[PDB]
Structures are given as C-alpha cells and as structure tokens.
C-alpha cells in the first residue's frame, strides 16, 4: 500500500 507521507503534496483521492 502506498505511503501518503512519501509526498504530502499528493492527495490519493480519485
């Protein structure tokens, strides 16, 4: 599963 804190500038929502 992806780490949302790898790049905080990325919101994972579709």
């Amino acid at each position, epitope marked *: 599963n*992806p780490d949302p804190n*790898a*790049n905080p500038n990325v*919101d994972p929502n579709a």
Partner: antibody, heavy 121, light 114 residues
Framework: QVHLVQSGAEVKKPGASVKVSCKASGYTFTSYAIHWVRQAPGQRLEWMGWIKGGNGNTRYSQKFQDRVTITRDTSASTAYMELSSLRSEDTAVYYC??????????????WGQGTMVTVSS | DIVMTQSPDSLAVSLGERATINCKSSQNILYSSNNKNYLAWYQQKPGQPPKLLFYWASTRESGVPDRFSGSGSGTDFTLTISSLQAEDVAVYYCHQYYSSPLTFGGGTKVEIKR
C-alpha cells in the same frame, strides 16, 4: 505564478557544510511541502527530503538522514536545506520543488531554478 | 527502496516517428483500493529543472501535447512520443511517489537522428 527562487551557486570545501535556501511565493506557504532533490552532473535525480511549509514536519531520505537538515521560515516563506560533512559525490544541482502537487482540485509541479554546489578545495 | 529501471538508456528517433521509453518498478505501484498508478513522467532539458509530463502514470499534465502518451500499469510503464519534434528531444525520467524514499529512473536520453 507560484514561484520557487533558490539561493545562488556555491563552492564548498570537503567536510564543510552548505545551506541552500528556497523562497516560495504565489501560494499559501503553510499549505504544501517543499521537497529537496539533487542531481549530480549527468546522473539521475536523487530525492533528498521534504518539509511542510506550515506544519514543519520533515522527512529525510535515509541516505541523507545523518547529514541533512530541512528547515522553514513561515514569515519569510523560505525553506532551507543544509548539507554537512560535504563529500565528493555532493557536487550537484540542488533543487527545491513542489513535487507533483495533486490536490482534490488541481495538479501541478513546480521546481526552483536549482543551486549548483561544487565540493572542491 | 523502489528501484526504477528505464530502458533504453538513450534512444535515437527521427522526426514524426514514435519514441518509446520503458520504465519498470521493483515493486507494484498500483494501489488496488483506488486503481491509481503512483508514477509520474518528467521532462528535462539541459540546465533546466524537470517538467512534469504525466502523473497517475497516464493522466496528462495540462499543456503537454497530445502526441505524448502514458501507458502501463503495476510495474511496467511506457512513455510514447507518437510524433517526435525537436522540442521533445530531452531526457525522460520515470518517478514513483508510491512510497518513501521518492525515487527516479536512471533516465532515457531521447536523441534525434537524421
């Protein structure tokens, strides 16, 4: 219109330290995290770290965890990256960047102009 | 440590023709939960900072000409320049933002042949 303006190029002695600055404008500085990414001549981009412009939490690459410090001044809207114990492979262009900002509303990606750092006596 | 491996290291393609750049990731960067591929394609001209071309593997960046296309999923990704012109000659990086540390491929130098 969102701008990342980095400090000027530098020559540093081996084992010394270097602080590169990144002045951010055009956006709410507290909203996003600024990344530091370096590129030795002709080599691939090496991601160094990021710091949230308002919060202040940092995440470093494990390769630079020992020698790197990312800091921020929320008033001056400036991120700083300090690399210490400068070795030979540290000679590179050091970019700050708003790497792949993918908000629920927008998507963009902005870099500074880069800062050459040559580690030489 | 998601290793990003590009192929070939340098491509020599002629005007109007297709350029193909493969990028393989050492681990699957497709999240099943949202069906998104955590991969970006960056464009870099010499002396300039890299320019985002694609994110979510294939979602176009605003401004990138439609001759640029992103294909692929999971661990295998491809950047296709269906009709090459001089302003596309650059070095092409894949990049994963799936996990930390963020990593880039070794880059593919897109050269122009006569």
């Amino acid at each position: 219109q969102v701008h990342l303006v980095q400090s000027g190029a530098e020559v540093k002695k081996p084992g010394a330290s270097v602080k590169v600055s990144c002045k951010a404008s055009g956006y709410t500085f507290t909203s996003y995290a600024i990344h530091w990414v370096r590129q030795a001549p002709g080599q691939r981009l090496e991601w160094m770290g990021w710091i949230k412009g308002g919060n202040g939490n940092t995440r470093y690459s494990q390769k630079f965890q020992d020698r790197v410090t990312i800091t921020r001044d929320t008033s001056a809207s400036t991120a700083y990256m300090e690399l210490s114990s400068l070795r030979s492979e540290d000679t590179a262009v050091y970019y700050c960047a708003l790497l792949t900002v993918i908000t629920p509303d927008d998507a963009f990606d902005i870099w500074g102009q880069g800062t050459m750092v040559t580690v030489s006596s | 440590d998601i290793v990003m491996t590009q192929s070939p290291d340098s491509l020599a393609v002629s005007l109007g023709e297709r350029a193909t750049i493969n990028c393989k990731s050492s681990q699957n960067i497709l999240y099943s939960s949202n069906n998104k591929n955590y991969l970006a394609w960056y464009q870099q001209k010499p002396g300039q900072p890299p320019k985002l071309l694609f994110y979510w593997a294939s979602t176009r960046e605003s401004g990138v000409p439609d001759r640029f296309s992103g294909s692929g999923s999971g661990t295998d990704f491809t950047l296709t320049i269906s009709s090459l012109q001089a302003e596309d000659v650059a070095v092409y990086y894949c990049h994963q933002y799936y996990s930390s540390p963020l990593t880039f491929g070794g880059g593919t130098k897109v050269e122009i042949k006569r």
